[PDB]
Amino acid sequence: PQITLWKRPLVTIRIGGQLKEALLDTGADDTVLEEMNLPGKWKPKMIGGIGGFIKVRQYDQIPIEICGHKAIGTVLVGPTPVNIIGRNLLTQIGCTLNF
Amino acid sequence: PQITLWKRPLVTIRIGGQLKEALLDTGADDTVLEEMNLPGKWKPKMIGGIGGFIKVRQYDQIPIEICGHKAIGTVLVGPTPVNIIGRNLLTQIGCTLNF
Numbered sequence: 001p002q003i004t005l006w007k008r009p010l011v012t013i014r015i016g017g018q019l020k021e022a023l024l025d026t027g028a029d030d031t032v033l034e035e036m037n038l039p040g041k042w043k044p045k046m047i048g049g050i051g052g053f054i055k056v057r058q059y060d061q062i063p064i065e066i067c068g069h070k071a072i073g074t075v076l077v078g079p080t081p082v083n084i085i086g087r088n089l090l091t092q093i094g095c096t097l098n099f
Numbered sequence: 100p101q102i103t104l105w106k107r108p109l110v111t112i113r114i115g116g117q118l119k120e121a122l123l124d125t126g127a128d129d130t131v132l133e134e135m136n137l138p139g140k141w142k143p144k145m146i147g148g149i150g151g152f153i154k155v156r157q158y159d160q161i162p163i164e165i166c167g168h169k170a171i172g173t174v175l176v177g178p179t180p181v182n183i184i185g186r187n188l189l190t191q192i193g194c195t196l197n198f
């Protein structure tokens with residue numbers, strides 16, 4: 001699709017078998033989801049945002065369907081204010097900015 | 100132009116007589132610039148992200164040129180680690196997400 005920006009670019013995603021809403025976030029290097037269970041191994045990690053640093057769980061090579069497009073990549077889980085799809089997966093689905 | 104997301108979508112902006120590098124950020128409702136002593140009236144605000152909130156100064160109807168395109172609107176000034184162009188100005192320069 002082409003998505004304009006007068007509203008938040010929210011889309012439905014499918015991960016670990018479950019549907020969620022997430023924000024397409026070009027300012028995010030990484031994809032960060034709110035607290036949830038995912039299967040398999042994870043690593044403790046820390047990431048920083050506008051307000052400071054948080055602790056997250058890093059899950060690698062996780063399949064995620066984003067607005068109908070498949071990605072498989074790193075998903076961080078932790079206390080983000082909202083679910084965000086970052087550039088690591090935006091690149092996978094062929095997302096670009098255009099003006 | 101079309102901007103891929105392999106790297107941070109940083110572009111040159113001009114504001115208050117200074118040139119800066121800023122993220123084209125679809126995850127940002129508002130535009131948030133690193134501390135700078137702009138003239139004029141302002142109002143206090145708090146904005147939240149990963150890590151928590153920061154205190155910013157809200158300035159209205161500030162002209163800003165983004166990658167050669169003119170815009171004018173609200174800019175928040177405060178201790179952000181990166182200059183952030185949010186949707187309030189992305190819409191004004193005709194920016195969309197495409198995949």
Ligand SMILES: CCC(CC)CN(C[C@@H](O)[C@H](Cc1ccccc1)NC(=O)O[C@H]1CO[C@H]2OCC[C@H]21)S(=O)(=O)c1ccc2c(c1)OCO2
Binds near residue numbers: 030049051081126181
């Ligand atoms: C609520 C949705 C986002 C937070 C999730 C909002 N952020 C914009 C993001 O794009 C920031 C923009 C940002 C970018 C770098 C540093 C600080 C902020 N990115 C961000 O936090 O990314 C993190 C995930 O990947 C990592 O790579 C970048 C930092 C990490 S924000 O910077 O906190 C932000 C910006 C404008 C706003 C706002 C909050 O509230 C109202 O207006």
